[PDB]
């Protein structure tokens, strides 16, 4: 049986990040745009979009 590993997301505030390829079995990586995350105390990443 396999076991999927999901590292914690890296939310970048007021900027952008690029995908990096790696030699891992069935590796997958993508970068999304326009996220405005929320946490219990509030919403960080001051930039709205």
């Amino acid at each position: 049986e396999y076991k999927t590993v999901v590292p914690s997301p890296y939310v970048k505030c007021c900027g952008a990040s690029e995908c990096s390829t790696k030699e891992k079995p069935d590796y997958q990586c993508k970068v999304y745009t326009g996220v405005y995350p929320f946490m219990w105390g509030g919403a960080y990443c001051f930039c709205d979009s």
Partner: protein, 49 residues
């Protein structure tokens, strides 16, 4: 093939090399959330069992 016997294969128990094909696919996170959604075809070994 994904979902059936042998989706992931290893040449030996202690061998470092691994071949994995399980149709892992990432999706866009919901607005105002931090969860890293993903989808994946279930294990082929647990089905073969």
């Amino acid at each position: 093939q994904p979902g059936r016997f042998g989706d992931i294969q290893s040449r030996t128990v202690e061998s470092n090399d691994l071949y994995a094909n399980t149709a892992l696919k990432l999706a866009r996170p919901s607005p105002g959330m931090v969860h890293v959604p993903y989808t994946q075809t279930p294990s082929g070994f647990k089905y073969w069992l």
